[PDB]
């Protein structure tokens, strides 16, 4: 998972599209 | 992304409003 960055730095989209299908 | 670095599914209601119809993949697995 990367939602973990979103809860410690400066959240981005590109953390979304790069966990999905 | 919202404005503040709050922890929360809110970056799961996010995966809904980009990726949506298809649920989502994620990483490590069986």
Sequence with gaps: GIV???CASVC?????????N | FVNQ?????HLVEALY???????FFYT???
């Design chain 2, 5 to 9: 670095h709050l922890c929360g599914s």
């Design chain 2, 28 to 30: 490590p697995k069986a």
């Design chain 1, 12 to 20: 981005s989209l590109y953390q979304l599209e790069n966990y999905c």
């Design chain 1, 4 to 6: 973990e960055q979103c």
């Design chain 2, 17 to 23: 409003l980009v990726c949506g119809e298809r649920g």
